């Protein structure tokens, strides 16, 4: 069949990338038993996570470029196999430089995992159904992060942490061979109807304007997601429960934002003057700017908890959503032989925006104020969003001048 | 004439890149007057230098790729003009986030400076004279770092620090217009005899084996240059004078290593079975491995100061030298329309090796020992160097099998 192989491959990629993000954060999930068995300094823990972050930052770009030419099935399954073998080796090992070297190799394979899912979603799902299944496969990450600490607590209650990571690695080995058996790269590999130069991709201005948009939106995400609790504790007198519930409501709004961004974007593609995935994208960046303004101005010590959770969920709907849409458009606006390169350049701008939003935002927050820092992030977001509204208005004027 | 325009353009690039590295480190040179006028935390100083380091890391690659297509004269002079305008704006400004934003823009333009010098040295100097003038133009950086604190002390004694950076920025503006007037891109732009795809460059294995060699050599450089004083204070009982004089002798040996690497490499190109710039390169990586072995084993608390300065100078001759040769070969083994891309990928591996050698080497040093950490770096260096000797022996066997 056609939809049969579609749902078999999507369930295989769902389970595979679920075990990917389960092993992207397994050390963070198993941290209490590991620090109970052997003492590790917090600088060592931050270094192990930072080595994974640097390896995953490199391996996003390297995996996109290498997933352009190589087959997506073997590359996905080989990465998940390396993930499993790394977690087995992590269960065998008992020291911090070997923990960091193995977790660096895990960061490499975690980067190796996703651009095959992007290539297979592009080959199997038409653009009327590409965004919503992109969104479901990207909230496989959210399901893995939700069932991570729960299964970590269950396996720490029942088993040791050694056997927990050994069973996680063995499960990722078995599911890597199952994703090698189940996933197919294109419908031409079975017998179904299968549905430019790299300099032309790099010299295309739409890739770079999408790149700067993803820079701004992921920087705003990283700013608020890393410093919203600090903005509510230190300046506006909110409790730690309010900041923690703000982050939880922002993540719930982000789940809803990814899913609704994919579905409403595919509804916009189906009902259709430019890319139809922009009418949700720019309206939702404008909603992100409105949520930042309402969160910076109207939140006070006397603000109701319901209103600050509403602003958290509205920002989560409006920041995770445009990032999911930038992933969809970056995989989609490129040619099929260069789509991993486009999504890889977008992930490179994720790394640039994460750097620009982590530490310089803390410096603007330390020297001026927290409100002045989020005002700077709001000025960047509002200026960029108004610039994109001017760009789509200018493109509509150009397309009117064509006809 | 021909040699007349050659020496005019080389003196112009010498003065220009000298003012580049003078303004890459002017904040580090003017630090005492700046912290006397306004108090800055050491985290803020490390953040300003780290923002320059990240911007320079990005701008190496971006400037190589953009110096492939764009003209080298305008790009060099525009970068030096942005350097001057940034230092003037830095003299006008009086706060830490604006210091960091301007110094980020300075890191961008400092990255923008050098790949035009690489392109112009490739267009004007033949390969029998390319390496030695590469070496002299790269020790313009050493001359700038040597005359940096001296002129900083003189201008802090005579003038303020505001007017010091204002005169530095004004001098870089004037010298940017002079480097726009004096430098020429190619000999065809005057009337003299002027002497492949990017996928073919990326898929070439020689670029990637040169890439991994530069990874190893710059990692070994960064390891010993950042942790030799720590290896001599904490483990081997040497004084702080011995560690400081070790770093000074390693930098003097590095000056000699860059100059002698360029000159002996061009002598090897002139006397000539493979690239003739390898017989010095691999012998000198082997000398780097021998210097690391003799520094790890034979240095003790009872070691003479002359012997440890000899090992510092022998490592400096043998680590800065292969990095200068990797720069020469990366600019040279690529086609002239893609040479900045090759040197940009090599600078990307400078960033990867700097990350891999800064903090994980500190972790191996903290958990095992300092001697075990430099033993790990020595194992990486010796394994890589023996692998390159096996590669050139295998290539000589292949070229014997051809004829």
UniProtKB/Swiss-Prot annotation, chains A, B:
What is the disorder linked to it? Glycogen storage disease 1B: A metabolic disorder characterized by impairment of terminal steps of glycogenolysis and gluconeogenesis. Patients manifest a wide range of clinical symptoms and biochemical abnormalities, including hypoglycemia, severe hepatomegaly due to excessive accumulation of glycogen, kidney enlargement, growth retardation, lactic acidemia, hyperlipidemia, and hyperuricemia. Glycogen storage disease type 1B patients also present a tendency towards infections associated with neutropenia, relapsing aphthous gingivostomatitis, and inflammatory bowel disease. Glycogen storage disease 1C: A metabolic disorder characterized by impairment of terminal steps of glycogenolysis and gluconeogenesis. Patients manifest a wide range of clinical symptoms and biochemical abnormalities, including hypoglycemia, severe hepatomegaly due to excessive accumulation of glycogen, kidney enlargement, growth retardation, lactic acidemia, hyperlipidemia, and hyperuricemia.
Which body tissues produce this protein? Mostly expressed in liver and kidney.
Transmembrane ranges?
A: 80-100, 101-121, 135-155, 163-183, 200-220, 241-261, 279-299, 306-326, 345-365, 371-391
Instruction: Tell where it localizes.
Output: Endoplasmic reticulum membrane
Which InterPro entries does UniProt cross-reference here? MFS (IPR011701), MFS_dom (IPR020846), MFS_trans_sf (IPR036259), OPA_Antiporter (IPR051337), Sugar-P_transporter_CS (IPR021159), Sugar_P_transporter (IPR000849)
This chain's source organism reads Homo sapiens
List the protein's name: Glucose-6-phosphate exchanger SLC37A4
Q: Which family does it belong to?
A: Belongs to the major facilitator superfamily. Organophosphate:Pi antiporter (OPA) (TC 2.A.1.4) family.
In its keyword annotation, does this UniProt entry include Transcription? no
Q: Which ranges of the sequence are coiled-coil?
A: none
């Amino acid at each position: 069949g056609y939809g049969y192989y579609r749902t078999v491959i999507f369930s295989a990629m769902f389970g595979g990338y679920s075990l990917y993000y389960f092993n992207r954060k397994t050390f963070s999930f198993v941290m209490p038993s590991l620090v109970e068995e052997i003492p590790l300094d917090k600088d060592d823990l931050g270094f192990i996570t930072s080595s994974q972050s640097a390896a995953y930052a490199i391996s996003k770009f390297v995996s996109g470029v290498l997933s352009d030419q190589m087959s997506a099935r073997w590359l996905f399954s080989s990465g998940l196999l390396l993930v499993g073998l790394v977690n087995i080796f992590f269960a065998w090992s008992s020291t911090v430089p070997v923990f960091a070297a193995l977790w660096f190799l895990n960061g490499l394979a975690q980067g190796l995992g996703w651009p095959p899912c992007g290539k297979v979603l592009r080959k199997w799902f038409e653009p009327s159904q590409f965004g919503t299944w992109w969104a479901i496969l990207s909230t496989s990450m959210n399901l893995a992060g939700g069932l991570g600490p729960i299964l970590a607590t269950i396996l720490a209650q029942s088993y040791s942490w050694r056997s927990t990571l050994a069973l996680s690695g063995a499960l990722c080995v078995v599911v890597s061979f199952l994703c090698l058996l189940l996933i197919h790269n294109e419908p031409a590999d079975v017998g179904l109807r299968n549905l430019s130069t790299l300099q032309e991709l790099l010299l295309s201005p739409y890739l770079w304007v999408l790149s700067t948009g993803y820079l701004v939106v992921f920087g705003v995400k990283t700013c608020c997601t890393d410093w919203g609790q600090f903005f509510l504790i230190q300046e506006k007198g909110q409790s730690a429960l309010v900041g923690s519930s703000y982050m939880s409501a922002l993540e719930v709004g982000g789940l809803v934002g990814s899913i609704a961004a994919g579905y409403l974007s595919d509804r916009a593609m189906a009902k259709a003057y430019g890319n139809p995935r922009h009418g949700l994208l720019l309206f939702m960046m404008a909603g992100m700017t409105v949520s930042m303004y309402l969160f910076r101005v109207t939140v006070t010590s006397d603000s109701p908890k319901l209103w600050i959770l509403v602003l958290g969920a509205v920002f989560g709907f409006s920041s995770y959503g445009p990032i999911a849409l930038f992933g969809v458009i970056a995989n989609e606006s490129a040619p099929p032989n260069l789509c991993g390169t486009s999504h890889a350049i977008v992930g490179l701008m994720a790394n640039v925006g994460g750097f620009l939003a982590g530490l310089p935002f803390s410096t603007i927050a330390k020297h001026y104020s927290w409100s002045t820092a989020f005002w700077v992030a709001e000025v960047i977001c509002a200026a960029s969003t108004a610039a994109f509204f001017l760009l789509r208005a200018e493109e509509e004027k150009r397309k009117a001048e064509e006809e």
